[PDB]
């Protein structure tokens, strides 16, 4: 064990670890992996300072979603409660204080006019990041460099992880109720669950490109149903491929994280009934939580790369015309369809990241002219088929993204 750390024993007999050089505690043994991630994550907590000014520039509007969002904001401004709710925090204790104080209260009191003390937009922004602190063990990423947030299947290392997921639940819901934007980085598959929708095989590509490609070719227990080339070892045949893919796809989305997800929803619902989101889809829901940014086309255009196309190619030229005709909401919806998210990083389109590292936006000539445009989220890649009439593309583009 490295200098500064000790292995203490809580009065219930469980073992945790104290880092005396950073006055921190964690339930996890200090791997060289942990000191790596904690050191890195804290280096990113420092830069959070300046990025709050950029965050301020996120916005929503002052059946469509402009519609649906006013209907929602009304359902909240009506079920609201009188008075105020007071939270007090200090900068080295945003998480510890927030956590203990919000779980103390009955969930409805979180629907009063929240008064943070030490600033609300700062608080939701900061706390939305403080909960990814590796100290707590709740999350892991799926790609290099913080790309694809996921519940950590080994969260149980932290004996209290279900309570923490309930607090995040409560916290995400307060944001929706009181109308503030967060920055945690949940994926669309996670919003789909908040809406009782079933993640599909296409969604897997956002989360596990390699695993998705396996299911693409030729289409339980520690991964039941036997393949070569309930049932402890029932062979996968062409006369039961369909059910294998369906059972195994669901498995990849739920495995290891079923308790943690329930506790998240349980926490969300207490504060804002999950059925208040009946109207919304997964992309519209990420919009509310995250907020819209204004997409500027000149930035997008210099930073987009091409494959088999060129700046002056025929359909690549019609693509950007449909964009200029598009309004910012449709622009963001195009953004989500292709990158997986409505969140554009601080640098601009020049700095969007991907599964395997940095990855600018990419439009590729692929597919027959009878196809819709496809995307590959993990590569931020758009497949625009070689279309023949500009209005044909217009139809197929605006259809591919509105589904």
Numbering used by the authors: 332 to 393, 493 to 548, 559 to 659, 671 to 680, 690 to 863
What does the paper say about this structure?
Importantly, key residues involved in the WW2L-HECT interaction (e.g., Met627 in WWP1) are highly conserved in all three proteins. We noticed that Tyr543, the key residue responsible for binding to WW4 in WWP1, is conserved in WWP2 and Itch, which suggests the possibility that the multi-lock autoinhibition mode of WWP1 may be conserved in WWP2 and Itch as well. The GST pull-down experiments further validated this assumption. Although WW2L and LWW34 could interact with HECT, the entire WW region exhibited the strongest binding. In sharp contrast, WW1, WW2, WW34, or L alone could not form a stable complex with HECT. Moreover, when WW in WWP2 robustly interacted with HECT (WT), the Y491AHECT (corresponding to Tyr543 in WWP1) and M575EHECT (corresponding to Met627 in WWP1) mutations, which were predicted to impair packing in WW4-HECT and WW2-HECT, respectively, significantly weakened the interaction between WW and HECT in WWP2, and the Y491A, M575E double mutation completely eliminated the interaction. Accordingly, the W358AWW2 (corresponding to Trp409 in WWP1) and H465AWW4 (corresponding to His517 in WWP1) mutations, which were predicted to impair the packing of WW2-HECT and WW4-HECT, respectively, significantly weakened the interaction between WW and HECT in WWP2, and the W358, H465A double mutation completely disrupted the interaction. Finally, both the Y491A and M575E mutations in WWP2 12L34HECT resulted in elevated ligase activity compared to that of the WT, possibly due to the impaired intramolecular interaction.
The Nedd4 family E3s have nine members in humans (WWP1/2, Nedd4/4 L, Smurf1/2, NEDL1/2, and Itch), which share a common N-terminal domain architecture comprised of a C2 domain and 2–4 WW domains that are responsible for subcellular localization and substrate recognition, respectively. Each HECT-type E3 contains a characteristic HECT domain at its C terminus, which catalyzes the transfer of ubiquitin from E2 to itself and then to the specific substrate. The HECT domain adopts a bilobal structure, in which the E2-binding N-lobe is connected by a flexible hinge loop to the catalytic C-lobe. To prevent excessive ubiquitination of targets and self-destruction by autoubiquitination, HECT-type E3s normally adopt an inactive state characterized by intra- or inter-molecular interaction.
